[PDB]
C-alpha cells in the first residue's frame, strides 16, 4: 500500500526505502531526493576509512532517523548499491553507532566516481570495534535502495 505519510520528491529520488516499513510516499516504499535527505538534518563523521587519504569529513542524515521516518518494523536492512553489491545490515548498528548515509565528503557532494552519491559510512576511528571487516563490509558505497526484513 502507500500510505502517503511522507510527501512526494519534487526532484530525482537517489535514495528508495522498502520492505517492512509504515511510512511511503509509493508503493510500499519510501522515495527520497537530496534535497529530502538533506532536510532531515545533516550529521558529520570525521575519519580515517581503509579506502581514503587520511582523516576526512563526511556530512550526512543519521541512518537511525531514517528507519524512524520510514516506521521500519524490521530488524535487518539490506543495502542495493548502483554496482549490485547486497549487504545485510542490523539495523541496531545504527543507534548503538552514529552511522550516516554520506551525502558529502570534505565538503562536496559525491560523484559516483567517487563512491556517491549515498555512502554509509560509520565513525571507524570512534572505536576499535568498528576497525574491523565487518563494519567495511556494511559500509555500502553508491547506495541506491534500503531493504528493510
Ligand atoms: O581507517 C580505518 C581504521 O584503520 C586502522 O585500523 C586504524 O588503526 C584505525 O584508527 C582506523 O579507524
Ligand atoms: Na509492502
Ligand atoms: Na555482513
Known amino acids: ?19 517492512n516499513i509504515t511510512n511511503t510516499n509509493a ?5 527520497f531526493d537530496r534535497d ?7 550529521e558529520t563523521v570525521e575519519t580515517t576509512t ?13 541512518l537511525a532517523k531514517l528507519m524512524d521516518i520510514v516506521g521500519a518494523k524490521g530488524t535487518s536492512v539490506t543495502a542495493v548499491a ?5 549487504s545485510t545490515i542490523p539495523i541496531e548498528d545504527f543507534k548503538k553507532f552514529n552511522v550516516i548515509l554520506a ?3 570534505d565538503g562536496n557532494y559525491m560523484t559516483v566516481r567517487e563512491k556517491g552519491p549515498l555512502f554509509v ?11 574491523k571487516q565487518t563494519y567495511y563490509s556494511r559500509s555500502a558505497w553508491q547506495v541506491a535502495k534500503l531493504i528493510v526484513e
Open 1 to 19: 500500500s502507500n500510505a502517503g505519510t511522507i510527501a512526494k520528491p519534487q526532484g530525482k529520488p537517489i535514495l528508495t526505502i522498502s520492505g
Open 27 to 31: 508503493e510500499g516504499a519510501a522515495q
Open 36 to 42: 529530502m535527505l538533506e532536510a532531515l538534518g545533516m
Open 50 to 62: 581503509p579506502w581514503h587519504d587520511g582523516r576526512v569529513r563526511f556530512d550526512g542524515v543519521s
Open 82 to 86: 548502483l554496482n549490485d553489491y547486497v
Open 103 to 105: 551525502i558529502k565528503l
Open 121 to 131: 559510512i560509520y565513525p571507524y576511528d570512534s572505536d576499535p570495534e568498528l576497525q
